[PDB]
Amino acid sequence: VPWVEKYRPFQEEVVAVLKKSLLPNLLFYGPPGTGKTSTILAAARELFGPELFRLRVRGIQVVREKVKNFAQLTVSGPPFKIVILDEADSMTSAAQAALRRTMEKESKTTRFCLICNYVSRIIEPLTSRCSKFRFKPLSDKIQQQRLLDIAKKENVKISDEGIAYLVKVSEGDLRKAITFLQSATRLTGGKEITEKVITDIAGVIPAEKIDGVFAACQSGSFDKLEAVVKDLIDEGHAATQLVNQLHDVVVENNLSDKQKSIITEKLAEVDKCLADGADEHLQLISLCATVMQQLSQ
Amino acid sequence: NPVLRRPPILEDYVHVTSTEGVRAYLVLRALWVDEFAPRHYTELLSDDFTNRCLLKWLKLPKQKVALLCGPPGLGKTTLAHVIARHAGYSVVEMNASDDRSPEVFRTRIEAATQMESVLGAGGKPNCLVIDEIDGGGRRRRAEGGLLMRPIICICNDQFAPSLRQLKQQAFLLHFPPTLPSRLVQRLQEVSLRQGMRADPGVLAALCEKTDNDIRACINTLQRRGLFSVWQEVFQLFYRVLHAAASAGEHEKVVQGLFDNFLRLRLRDSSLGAVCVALDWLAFDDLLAGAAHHSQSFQLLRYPPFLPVAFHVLFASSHTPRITFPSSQQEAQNRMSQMRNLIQTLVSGIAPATRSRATPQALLLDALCLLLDILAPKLRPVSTQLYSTREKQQLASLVGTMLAYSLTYRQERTPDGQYIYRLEPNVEELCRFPELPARKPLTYQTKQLIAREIEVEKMRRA
Amino acid sequence: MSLWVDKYRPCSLGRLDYHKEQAAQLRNLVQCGDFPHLLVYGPSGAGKKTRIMCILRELYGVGVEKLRIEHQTITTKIEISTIASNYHLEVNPSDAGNSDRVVIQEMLKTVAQSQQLETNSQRDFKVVLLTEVDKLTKDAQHALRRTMEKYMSTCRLILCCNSTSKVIPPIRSRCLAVRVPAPSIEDICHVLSTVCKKEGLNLPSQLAHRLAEKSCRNLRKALLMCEACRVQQYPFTADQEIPETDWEVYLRETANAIVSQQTPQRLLEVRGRLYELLTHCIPPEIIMKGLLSELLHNCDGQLKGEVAQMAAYYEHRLQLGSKAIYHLEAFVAKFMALYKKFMED
Amino acid sequence: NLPWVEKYRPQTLNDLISHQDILSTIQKFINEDRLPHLLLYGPPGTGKTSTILACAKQLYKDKEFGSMVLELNASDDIDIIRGPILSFASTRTIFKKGFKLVILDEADAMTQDAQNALRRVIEKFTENTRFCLICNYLSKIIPALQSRCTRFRFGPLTPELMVPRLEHVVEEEKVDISEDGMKALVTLSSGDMRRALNILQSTNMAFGKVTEETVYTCTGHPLKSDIANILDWMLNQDFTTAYRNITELKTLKGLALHDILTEIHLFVHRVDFPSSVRIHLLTKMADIEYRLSVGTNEKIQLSSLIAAFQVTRDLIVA
Amino acid sequence: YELPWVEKYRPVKLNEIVGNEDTVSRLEVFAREGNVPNIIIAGPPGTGKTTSILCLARALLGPALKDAMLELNASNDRGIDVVRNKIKMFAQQKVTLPKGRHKIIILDEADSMTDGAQQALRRTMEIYSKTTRFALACNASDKIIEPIQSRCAVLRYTKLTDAQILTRLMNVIEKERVPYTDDGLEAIIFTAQGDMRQALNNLQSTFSGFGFINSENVFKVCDEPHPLLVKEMIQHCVNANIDEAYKILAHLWHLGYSPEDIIGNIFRVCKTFQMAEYLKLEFIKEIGYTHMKIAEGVNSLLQMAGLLARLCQKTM
Ligand SMILES: Nc1ncnc2c1ncn2[C@@H]1O[C@H](COP(=O)(O)OP(=O)(O)OP(=O)(O)O)[C@@H](O)[C@H]1O
Ligand SMILES: Nc1ncnc2c1ncn2[C@@H]1O[C@H](COP(=O)(O)OP(=O)(O)OP(=O)(O)O)[C@@H](O)[C@H]1O
Ligand SMILES: Nc1ncnc2c1ncn2[C@@H]1O[C@H](COP(=O)(O)OP(=O)(O)OP(=O)(O)O)[C@@H](O)[C@H]1O
Ligand SMILES: Nc1ncnc2c1ncn2[C@@H]1O[C@H](COP(=O)(O)OP(=O)(O)O)[C@@H](O)[C@H]1O
């Protein structure tokens, strides 16, 4: 059993506004462990009662058929039953448009509480047809405390700075730090969790590699760039992770605003190219060439 | 300039400061052919290797099924019928014009195959034909193991992913085109029968206008307009004329432009022009992708401007030696046959309990495998210790060839010289042209390797 | 049973010649319960498949090496071949083309429904090793994550790819990232020397280093070239003529031809060479990578940045488009324009 | 209860606003018996479906409406054309004379083959049945199909005419709205009554009152003040401090880089940049939006927006 | 009730088709000679494809058209079970015809037929060639598989030029006594986009709405982003004047035109604009890239402003 559901328990005001309906469609978004599904289920139990239950959800044809068979059905007798559709963020644009159509022709007697990771919604359900409610993530200190408690009751040997690093590499949510802790204690046999094991589990590139990349760029010789990028690709480090860490380093150190601007334009277009399936090695070589041009000024 | 050094007196503004803090202020605002069908074996045309080499196999050396390849119109449909007529055999035919459900595909051929004729005993033999093949296929594969009457499936590529494993038990022939030395005589006889007159030169021209197609030739006693587009674009408003003149199929126009724009001689320093032309070709490719991914008919109004873009850039004073585009299609079918051959080899190797490598990883790393297969060519004479220590040598090498199912077979060139070729012929899968060529294996060494392969097969079994 | 590249593939995690720390971690992972879904990645020749087979060997029994061919059909019908064992199924759903979604769904459905036939003596799941997950389509990957989360209790997935860039983030979330780096030059020298020793041979360190550098840290290349240079000359020499594939040589000669003259005639000749490379079924991105690597050897330091940026730009456009020759050819043309202007001035 | 979009959906023809030209023309067609096939297109929520429904309801009484007006949606399922549409258009009436009516809502969602089949059906039975095609993008309709019908473009709803309908809604419903709240509601609507009424739902329900801060927080749209702050930081503060300020604001208010970028694009034309600076900014921002649309990291795209402005900082100052 | 002018002035003879002269003459030759072969009819919509095929069949068959001709549209079932059950059974049917006449099967809008249906069509066409002929029709010829084009005399139709549309408009205006001005004719021709059906529909719609035919009425009835506004915005982009071009674009946006409509009219106007031809091609490629973004879904005012900026910087 994963530690995610084992420990799944601020936003009761949305439950209050939902009960005060004597009702629109709902759009709950936020980091996954922020209890959006639990919130809507609690609102369900409070608004109908324990004896009345709802519909929770292959493509879109089966979704439309199920919603039709469910909404076009007489209720016990409150007027509007709902349908959830969690993980809506993964729906394609055509599936989202078909779902928007399904929300119509059924809006007379049913409601939808879409659960998503934010901006993935197309303009039709996101704007109009939904009441948005953002679920803020737990703050860093509370997250570290919760990870400490999990490590205590699971006899996991992790240090406090290890917990801080675990929250850092999974910034903005639980259920990723928790999974990383579980995978780390499985990989190490629980005996000891260090920085390197968390770094490898999270897929983070070591800071020594990033420092070497900047050193090679500052060296001004393209041969060193080729060597460092070839080594970074050979080590198997994802190019998107290198782009993220490189951007985090660049945007915060003491480079010139023009140098930061050029490097960040390059990082953004490299991120777009990598999203389109471009070669990691060529994208990283071009990015490091731009960085070398900026540093070797 | 819009940039101000001091804030506007009565206008809304925002300020922009430099990296040094200098600061500045910006305002913010607000009919004939079937009449002359071959009546007897003597009405066939000469210089033909098809009808002269299938009657050898069709008598009653142990091939089961038949197949087709080569160009169309070569009488592949009528050769079987006239051979049946001459040898005293009957004919059957089938199509996709009727319902070829997988189940009915069985019974539509079983009747043709395993029953005799309700007639005189002379007419009992039958000849069978299957047409327009490119559930039922799996049934064909199941039946092809054992059969009594060979069948013809009309295709044109023996290197197919499915029919290659059927042609291995089939006596597929050579398919040379029919030379017109007697086409003109046949057409003269046809015209005399039909009361028409034409000189030999005129008749020959009418024959060669249609690539000497006998069907079209006999229908003549009664091409491609893309060269016009290529001529209008490649030699001298004009551009509106090319936009209007591109009324036709567009993919082949673009193929012709791509194949021919590097053969013109406007300038040797036109690398900028060819860069712009390749930019336009990439734009056309992206348009083709985007009009399909996001189905949009309005987005395919731009591709007609590719010929216009190849004008302006490359329009010159004549010298338009324009050839038909073949590079893209030839590359397509060659890569398809390479993919079929790698599939054949990988089916030989990958699931054989071992050989843990991706087919792509294997393909990029198989030339070294051939180099291990090379082996010292010391021409072993002794029945033991084949010029070296056998275990670290030819024994392990024949083991690894049996792993990949690589074998050496016998072939005879038309020159008559003996030759051995690797069984799935992975060399041309692996080797490239115009780079330093390595020496190959001797004939007798390949014979020894084949013999060792056979004894290894006997030992493993 | 004879190839050096296969004769000395380690059987168990305990006999891996490199990444021993990760092998120990993997044995710890298999030793405990609730074996998760693995996403093993790393450059080709790093050992991903070797590590996966070893993971199975301590996970299931030795009979995991008793590999037998299987074939199945899908409903769209497309026939696909697989490789299975008494405990795991290995399938590359990419080769089914755009119908990879239905084939992956059908394979996992069938294996999960078939594991229930009293097959729980060793483990309570069947491993479905997917190879070349990065070659799947987005819809296939969404079907994969759905099937993964739906039959987690009865079947386990191991995903093997060379780069996790094309793997959708949702799949990366559900799986455990097992990064298998390419072996270092020293590790490749050590394994080559051990192979030679176990073969009753002797390998000079200079030749081992030369093979390691020429292999580009691909271990199967290192072993293949070692065996090829062995059969070419039984006593190794520190300056031996180590062979290499003809597609690499052809790519290098293509780049040399691009450098040697910058004219549309040379452009058409290089286009013919690009056809030769493409039709031999080597990936267009590999062509671009090798072309750039050799072109940089023939460029001044002031030119290498622009050449590399053009290579990345045109490989990106190649990924967007559908005809690789257009963008390969445009890259070659742009490079000759730049090189001609630079050498001219 | 029932949402106000459905509750306040117009019924009589006089409820519709700003489409007096279109309404007068369609009603004149009805009166003179020259009603052609109709293609109503425009932005969502501007009253095309309500317009055609009002015209159909004045054409046919309630008991004759259900047998003389076939309403179908193309997004529901080519079988539509060959089944219900072909059967309805090819047959005569039940208990009336005159033409029947087909209202195909969301006609832009048909495939091109379906639109060709619909063109054939419309051509064959033009005398007995009139078709009304409702779509958002006229460009999605094949030129063959849109040459069979007269096109009416329902434009966006101007504030000077949108305000009275929302005033009726806020008078009938017990909503307390401010002047700035009404202005913000109109602005976020941008000519969409369905959007305006849904925003009014969400705001008046979650916060109880409708005001600029309330509506902007409910919809999640960035304030004018927040966009001005972002522009000020980008044009004045250094790259690191501007990045920190914008990241903190964005994560505090849950702002989307899509909306931030959309509003900064407007400010780019508001404030008086030099022509070259404006060209550079427009090109860079269009690039950023395109890169956003594919599923990239918003951190890096935000840094690229900051970069696009930091490049122009010194160029503007000099 | 009166027939629409698209049907009121539908050609009934091949002599009154103002389309492509070569193909029309070829069809008249087929109608006169009699032994018409299988023909494929490809071209833009509204050029006369179906009209030409029906006129040819009518001229060939006379009174025997009702029982000798099988006309199938996009609204009919034309699946694999039709080319094999309906088409085959009609081909096998016995109709007595004059010596040079054949049963004509009109698979109209055949580009909508699947690959399997046309494969079924292939030697159903080939076998019964002695007794029946097939007259296909499509907008895109590449949608018809290779064998059908191989065994058909592919006739090509092209967009009616401005002069042909103008002559037919004059004929219809004279026969209908419709007031007009030359500017209204130019507006109708511009909105036609080379379709006679579209030109007739627009003329009839303007007559129905306002009676008089002038540019103002035409663009009031055929509402699209005005070609003059789009033209002057393109001119501003040529002069690298981003501010004025964006003024025009933002005015179009406030009027409510979708970015798809705006970019379509931008391409249409820039296609026949007064530029250096190299700059015109550069503009066309940039507009095509922006339209690809718009169709992909990235359809905002910022995208169109970015297109304007890229056009402006194409001229530096
Ligand atoms: N060797 C030959 N002698 C006499 N006539 C021939 C010969 N080969 C072909 N013909 C004639 O050529 C004409 C066209 O041949 P046909 O249509 O049968 O081509 P095919 O090669 O069988 O076709 P495909 O390859 O497309 O299936 C027929 O009239 C046939 O009799
Ligand atoms: N002129 C108007 N007067 C009053 N309400 C209007 C008007 N236009 C639109 N609406 C409102 O729009 C909502 C439904 O929009 P409707 O379907 O009528 O328009 P539309 O533009 O055809 O929509 P869509 O094309 O997105 O389906 C209702 O809440 C209705 O009150
Ligand atoms: N050359 C022409 N001369 C006169 N009118 C024409 C011409 N071409 C088209 N038209 C007009 O267009 C109408 C239909 O044209 P067409 O023959 O293309 O039929 P269609 O069914 O609309 O075709 P498709 O759906 O295949 O594009 C005719 O009735 C006529 O009003
Ligand atoms: N410890 C090791 N000793 C020898 N060879 C190894 C070792 N680890 C990995 N390899 C090599 O790595 C290669 C496989 O790696 P990889 O490319 O990831 O998978 P695949 O088996 O699909 O090629 C094998 O050829 C194997 O010889």
Short mmCIF file of N, CA and C in Angstrom, two decimals, chain A residues 29 118-119 123 126-127 132, chain D residues 188 195 216 219-224 226-227 230 250 253-267 285 289 292 298 305, chain E residues 302:
data_model
loop_
_atom_site.label_atom_id
_atom_site.label_comp_id
_atom_site.label_asym_id
_atom_site.label_seq_id
_atom_site.Cartn_x
_atom_site.Cartn_y
_atom_site.Cartn_z
N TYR A 29 -9.02 23.04 -8.66
CA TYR A 29 -7.67 22.86 -9.16
C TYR A 29 -6.65 23.17 -8.08
N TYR A 118 -5.12 22.82 -13.10
CA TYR A 118 -5.13 24.24 -13.42
C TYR A 118 -5.30 24.48 -14.93
N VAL A 119 -4.28 25.03 -15.60
CA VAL A 119 -4.45 25.73 -16.87
C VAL A 119 -4.79 24.79 -18.03
N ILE A 123 -10.97 26.93 -23.05
CA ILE A 123 -11.63 28.17 -22.67
C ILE A 123 -13.12 27.98 -22.40
N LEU A 126 -13.48 26.37 -18.65
CA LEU A 126 -12.75 27.22 -17.72
C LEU A 126 -13.44 28.57 -17.56
N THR A 127 -13.72 29.23 -18.66
CA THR A 127 -14.44 30.50 -18.65
C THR A 127 -15.91 30.24 -18.90
N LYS A 132 -14.63 28.35 -10.38
CA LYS A 132 -13.27 27.95 -10.05
C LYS A 132 -13.01 28.09 -8.55
N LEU D 188 -14.63 41.48 -18.03
CA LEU D 188 -14.31 40.06 -18.06
C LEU D 188 -15.26 39.29 -18.96
N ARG D 195 -20.86 34.18 -20.31
CA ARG D 195 -19.72 34.43 -19.42
C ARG D 195 -20.07 35.45 -18.35
N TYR D 216 -12.66 39.73 -9.84
CA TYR D 216 -11.33 39.36 -10.33
C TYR D 216 -10.76 38.18 -9.56
N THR D 219 -12.89 34.96 -10.76
CA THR D 219 -12.50 34.49 -12.08
C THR D 219 -11.02 34.15 -12.16
N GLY D 220 -10.20 34.71 -11.27
CA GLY D 220 -8.77 34.53 -11.33
C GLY D 220 -8.06 35.45 -12.29
N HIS D 221 -8.77 36.40 -12.90
CA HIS D 221 -8.13 37.32 -13.82
C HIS D 221 -7.27 38.32 -13.06
N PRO D 222 -6.08 38.64 -13.56
CA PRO D 222 -5.24 39.61 -12.86
C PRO D 222 -5.84 41.00 -12.90
N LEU D 223 -5.66 41.73 -11.80
CA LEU D 223 -6.14 43.10 -11.72
C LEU D 223 -5.35 43.99 -12.68
N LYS D 224 -5.92 45.16 -12.96
CA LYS D 224 -5.17 46.18 -13.69
C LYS D 224 -3.96 46.63 -12.87
N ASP D 226 -2.29 44.77 -10.70
CA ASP D 226 -1.28 43.71 -10.72
C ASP D 226 -0.51 43.70 -12.03
N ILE D 227 -1.20 43.90 -13.16
CA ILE D 227 -0.51 43.95 -14.44
C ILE D 227 0.38 45.18 -14.53
N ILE D 230 3.45 44.35 -12.58
CA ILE D 230 4.32 43.44 -13.32
C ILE D 230 5.09 44.20 -14.40
N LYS D 250 2.50 36.07 -8.72
CA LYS D 250 1.81 35.04 -9.50
C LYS D 250 1.41 33.87 -8.62
N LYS D 253 -1.50 35.11 -6.06
CA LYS D 253 -2.83 35.28 -6.63
C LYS D 253 -3.22 34.15 -7.58
N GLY D 254 -2.36 33.16 -7.77
CA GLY D 254 -2.67 32.07 -8.68
C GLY D 254 -2.82 32.51 -10.12
N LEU D 255 -2.14 33.59 -10.50
CA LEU D 255 -2.27 34.12 -11.85
C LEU D 255 -1.69 33.15 -12.87
N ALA D 256 -2.29 33.15 -14.06
CA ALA D 256 -1.80 32.37 -15.19
C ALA D 256 -0.95 33.26 -16.08
N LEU D 257 0.18 32.71 -16.54
CA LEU D 257 1.01 33.44 -17.49
C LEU D 257 0.26 33.74 -18.78
N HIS D 258 -0.76 32.95 -19.11
CA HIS D 258 -1.61 33.26 -20.25
C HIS D 258 -2.31 34.60 -20.06
N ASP D 259 -2.94 34.80 -18.89
CA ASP D 259 -3.67 36.03 -18.64
C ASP D 259 -2.73 37.21 -18.43
N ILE D 260 -1.64 36.98 -17.69
CA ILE D 260 -0.62 38.01 -17.52
C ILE D 260 -0.11 38.48 -18.88
N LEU D 261 0.15 37.53 -19.77
CA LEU D 261 0.70 37.85 -21.08
C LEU D 261 -0.34 38.56 -21.94
N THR D 262 -1.60 38.13 -21.84
CA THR D 262 -2.68 38.78 -22.58
C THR D 262 -2.85 40.23 -22.16
N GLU D 263 -2.74 40.51 -20.86
CA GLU D 263 -2.91 41.89 -20.39
C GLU D 263 -1.67 42.74 -20.66
N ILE D 264 -0.48 42.16 -20.55
CA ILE D 264 0.73 42.89 -20.87
C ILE D 264 0.76 43.25 -22.35
N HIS D 265 0.22 42.38 -23.21
CA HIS D 265 0.13 42.72 -24.62
C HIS D 265 -0.69 43.99 -24.82
N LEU D 266 -1.79 44.13 -24.07
CA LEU D 266 -2.59 45.35 -24.16
C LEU D 266 -1.82 46.56 -23.67
N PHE D 267 -1.13 46.42 -22.53
CA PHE D 267 -0.35 47.54 -22.01
C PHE D 267 0.76 47.95 -22.96
N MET D 285 6.54 38.31 -27.30
CA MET D 285 5.38 37.88 -26.54
C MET D 285 4.55 36.87 -27.31
N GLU D 289 3.67 33.13 -25.96
CA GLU D 289 2.34 32.53 -25.91
C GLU D 289 2.30 31.21 -26.69
N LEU D 292 3.92 28.66 -24.62
CA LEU D 292 3.05 28.29 -23.51
C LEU D 292 2.02 27.26 -23.95
N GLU D 298 6.14 27.02 -16.92
CA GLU D 298 5.79 28.44 -16.89
C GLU D 298 6.86 29.28 -16.21
N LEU D 305 9.60 36.24 -20.63
CA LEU D 305 8.86 37.50 -20.71
C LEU D 305 9.64 38.63 -20.03
N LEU E 302 -2.87 38.71 -29.43
CA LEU E 302 -1.42 38.78 -29.36
C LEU E 302 -0.77 38.06 -30.54
#
